[PDB]
Design a protein around this ligand. Sequence first.
Ligand SMILES: CC(C)(COP(=O)(O)OP(=O)(O)OC[C@H]1O[C@@H](n2cnc3c(N)ncnc32)[C@H](O)[C@@H]1OP(=O)(O)O)[C@@H](O)C(=O)NCCC(=O)NCCNC(=O)CCCC(=O)c1ccccc1
Ligand SMILES: CC(C)(COP(=O)(O)OP(=O)(O)OC[C@H]1O[C@@H](n2cnc3c(N)ncnc32)[C@H](O)[C@@H]1OP(=O)(O)O)[C@@H](O)C(=O)NCCC(=O)NCCNC(=O)CCCC(=O)c1ccccc1
Lengths: 379, 378
Amino acid sequence: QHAKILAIGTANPPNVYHQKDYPDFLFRVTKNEHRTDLREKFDRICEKSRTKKRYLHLTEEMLKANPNIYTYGAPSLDVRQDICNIEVPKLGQEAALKAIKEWGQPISRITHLIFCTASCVDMPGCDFQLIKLLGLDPSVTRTMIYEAGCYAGATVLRMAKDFAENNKGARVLVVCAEITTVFFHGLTDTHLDILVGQALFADGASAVIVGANPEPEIERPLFEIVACRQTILPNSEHGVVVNIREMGFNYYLSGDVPKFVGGNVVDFMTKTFEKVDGKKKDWNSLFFSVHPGGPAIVDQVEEKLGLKEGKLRATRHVLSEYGNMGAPTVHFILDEMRNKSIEEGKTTTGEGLEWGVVIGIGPGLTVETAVLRSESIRC
Amino acid sequence: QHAKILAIGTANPPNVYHQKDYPDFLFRVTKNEHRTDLREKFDRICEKSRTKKRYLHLTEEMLKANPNIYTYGAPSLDVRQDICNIEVPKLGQEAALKAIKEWGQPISRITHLIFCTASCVDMPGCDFQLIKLLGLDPSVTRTMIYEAGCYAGATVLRMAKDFAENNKGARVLVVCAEITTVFFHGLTDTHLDILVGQALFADGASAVIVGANPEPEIERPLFEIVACRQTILPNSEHGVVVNIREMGFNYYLSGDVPKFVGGNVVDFMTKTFEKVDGKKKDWNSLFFSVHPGGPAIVDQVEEKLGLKEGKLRATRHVLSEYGNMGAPTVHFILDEMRNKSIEEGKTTTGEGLEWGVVIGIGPGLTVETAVLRSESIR
Ligand SMILES: CC(C)(COP(=O)(O)OP(=O)(O)OC[C@H]1O[C@@H](n2cnc3c(N)ncnc32)[C@H](O)[C@@H]1OP(=O)(O)O)[C@@H](O)C(=O)NCCC(=O)NCCNC(=O)CCCC(=O)c1ccccc1
Ligand SMILES: CC(C)(COP(=O)(O)OP(=O)(O)OC[C@H]1O[C@@H](n2cnc3c(N)ncnc32)[C@H](O)[C@@H]1OP(=O)(O)O)[C@@H](O)C(=O)NCCC(=O)NCCNC(=O)CCCC(=O)c1ccccc1
């Protein structure tokens, strides 16, 4: 009896930033309208981003009150943390309440909490703050995952699987929440990577309830977590770096990240499915939730696995409507897939297909995969 | 077939700071010899610390090169991280190689890595850096626990138990490493909590190998991880606070922490053992690894559980010889207990007793307990 996802909820900050307006906003509020050279480059990136809108906690009023946030390299960690240490658990709470509603059990049945964020760090942590906000049992068993990065949406499902399967009756609440205020930086041609993050990074939270042995007539599984694998892609340590600094969370992104993903995807898919059935080809038989770190990563997975037109629709839809929200994103994609499958009258939550995969990609470069089975559509 | 601890290794930085000498050192290198009132208070805290010596990576030359480290509130996180992000994995590597030696199996047999530190944070993390240093399989399954705090020496055993028990054949390397350079702060009469940390906090690393179903005549267990419980002590959110700031990792410690531990120990012990036995426990029948957050915390456990003289000897020995090294400390204590049990010709690794407990205590306040069984010395 494998661990099942029993519920998914999501949440975002209320302020919507349409991509068509974001270059004007960014260059105005950071006092960079004279940088027409960088504006040209940013326009090109935004046009390629395949991101139509994003939800962001950060406002112009926050930047006016804390101009060090947009002054490249100036001290600003403290103001960023004072925001994110509050907003990350709050956004997580909103998603968690939606997951708990779908699940339909009392909060007292939650035995385990996994909280994951790369947007802040504090002691006590976000897990403790969420317990307070939700009224979880003081004796919930907690795992607090700080600063793992963009593979962690798959990682938390792997962790929840082991906790749910080894602890009989356990019910694991998994919350991933991101507020990118800590990653916002000003513009300099010495650090062009910031233009990519300024185009793609976004705010959001997911909540997933995981448990083995669903209770008949109360609980309803959406997906089964079958097998997982984590691996480091060779010779790619420079791919994604984030340093926690006095200036905030400073990030460096190599232009070679998409090529590294495409050069390794057949291998990491083959080795993952070796844990299940030995699948080694015909990847279109699966459903997919691919972390959309950028559109070029999604395109590389599509090309090298030979995926047909539309196979990655749910992944692309989330990227378009929300951007790259970090770890929560693959859970938004699973929820979108479930929603569209209901809309289309499919026989399962995975686009009518039986088997699928979640692909998380982050620093290392590290890829974590989780093989899933879908479930029949009911309640 | 519960998960078992198959090996324990430990490491510390090379520089020894005897407590008798530390007040003179601290007040000299931080240019505070004029503060006679603070010196007198610090002397009193050190005399009560029950800590004889500590190992620290930080040196006077480092302070001279980076005086913002001892200038209270000055920006210094970047220099601290540049040190700790290197030194934490390096110290962890030393402890891990010792655990791997005892275990006796190839590094390629490790399937899972848990790395825990409250002393730094970076992406890729310490787990990635340790994989590089040791040559672990690039497909090891990793859990990177950053900034959990002083309960995590029990937490990592709980996590390792689940990973080892749910994955046939899995072998989990667990590494906890601390370098307190990030927590060093100068002296101000407005933040007296710093005098406590300056007296007690210290550097060290532990490594444990965990697996279920040890191979007969190849692997041998030291302890079995039976059951675990994590709980938040009521109305104690202000007990321990650590904020990651431009000035480093700033911390606040309530003087009520010992009383909170004492007020909850019967309850958390009772509820933990209810997971293993329907009969009530005689606390003196157990062996103990108690996180020595300070001597008063150890005293509160002894007092409220009615523990006999000598029951907490291993705990107090590690506090005396190493100070409070954070999450690794409870593993140093288990290693000391196993070593002393060999010296004394005891029948088990737990002082000749069958059942025992690891008590981790940290922010929340949060207590995590792990019920252990000992093993025969083999
Ligand atoms: C960029 C597009 C769309 C360009 O679209 P395309 O490539 O199709 O078009 P293109 O080739 O014309 O490029 C157009 C111009 O962008 C230039 N350019 C390209 N890449 C550049 C680079 N890396 N640095 C500098 N310039 C670059 C190039 O050089 C060209 O410049 P020019 O136009 O001047 O020639 C495409 O490449 C693409 O999706 N990429 C992959 C992006 C990637 O890795 N995401 C991983 C992100 N995860 C993290 O950050 C983790 C850390 C944050 C975190 O924890 C976190 C937490 C919470 C929430 C969120 C995040
Ligand atoms: C302090 C002793 C020994 C005093 O010994 P006793 O109590 O027996 O003697 P005592 O009563 O005479 O006190 C003598 C004078 O210390 C004064 N004093 C007392 N406590 C004070 C306080 N909190 N603030 C200000 N002043 C205080 C009092 O006010 C008196 O001042 P005066 O002498 O001027 O009157 C005793 O109490 C005791 O073990 N306590 C428990 C200490 C405690 O919580 N450890 C938890 C530590 N974990 C963390 O930090 C986690 C965060 C760091 C971290 O992640 C980390 C990572 C990696 C490695 C390491 C750490």
